[PDB]
Amino acid sequence: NAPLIGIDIGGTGIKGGIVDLKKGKLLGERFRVPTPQPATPESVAEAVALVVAELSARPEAPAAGSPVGVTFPGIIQHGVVHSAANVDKSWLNTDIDALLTARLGRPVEVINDADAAGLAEARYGAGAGVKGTVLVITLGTGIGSAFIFDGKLVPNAELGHLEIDGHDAETKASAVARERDGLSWDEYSVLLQRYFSHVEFLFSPELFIVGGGISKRADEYLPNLRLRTPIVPAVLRNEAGIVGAAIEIALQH
Template sequence: MVETTGSARTLAVDIGGSGIKVIVLDEAGEPLTERSRMETPQPPKPDAVLAVIAQLAAGQGEFDRVSVGFPGVVRNGVTYTAVNLDPAWMEFDLAAALQERLGKPVRVANDADMQGMGAIAGNGVELVVTLGTGFGSALFVNGKLVPNLEMGHHPFRKGETYEQQLRRTALDDIGQKRWNRRLEKAIGTLGRLFNYDCLYIGGGEAKKVSLELPANVKIVPNISGLLGGIALWRD
């Protein structure tokens, strides 16, 4: 086990459906390197993704441990769903495989959970959604994560899920104006469902949000998905 001293350096990894990003953080979660990115390999099978992470890590300098955000359900470092990647990720021990590849201890979390850890204030009910290849979600109560919330696959409207209505391909198909109207409806529905104190909207497509947001809804930068990596080591 790595000592959690002020000098511990964390390689934060964000695995997305279209891109894989990495950065090295200090103990306070401040970036020590420039973020680097590569396209997610196609098909996005585990060996290919691991190879990209190793290549990116090699350009980031020294680090002591690794945090990974993964787009699916994760338990104890094992991935159980990967709707926007490949079925080969079902019950794949990502933490063990990446630890063997990089020679450093690894912790893995759902990518929206990790984004939330980098964005929330830690007060009251806070909901995080990520807009990208898919639709991620994370719920926190007084800073504590409610695990395994896969809200993106729940029914939303017209017989489709939040993910089907708001993912990147939907944005491409219907255009930004209609997509924003759908998002406005989703914000209203989620507000009534969770009665959150604050909703954070992140992910690669958050930059396409053009509607006027309520005071308790905030856009967070995509890098939050990496900056949350340090929280995985706060036992």
């Protein structure tokens, strides 16, 4: 049926795509603009507007007033941001749905970035057909987590902020932390063994799906892990957030 525009707000880039929910893929190429710095509500709103404007002008674009799905790296409750771990703190308590709807001139509904990735994996990726608890852990600027149960999203799980060995988990195990501390893939594997085995004890999941940029290098560390839970890289990576954002619109509507 009718495609929907999905927007993924990341630390280094704000990208979007026209999503065909029938195939779980994008129509045409994804479009990206640099994440403004500082990334404030006002600057980010402008960047999102540019991405949406570009996609809306394409022949394969959905109706001009169709709702747009957008991701954000934080807790989202009733369109309001409740955490801003790696973004400007001015985002806290910001009604992002209202902010973007006003700027774009069409309905906009935001969802956590990891949650969106989870919806996508559950519907079109490594989580399809898997019942029970499925945890999608994304490794990038921060550590994101989508809690899926029986194919349904249990919203806003922030497992990247579990405390492990005296530290906020992502401060030591994010993709960024790995480079900052000069860790080899094997040393990083030690940190991940600790993280996943801990989360495994916390939830006894049926499956772990690893997302985020460096999940593309999963063969460098997953083979070293010794878990009771099967663990595989995510099917969608560069487009997981975009697709998941569109899925959320559909589910809500």
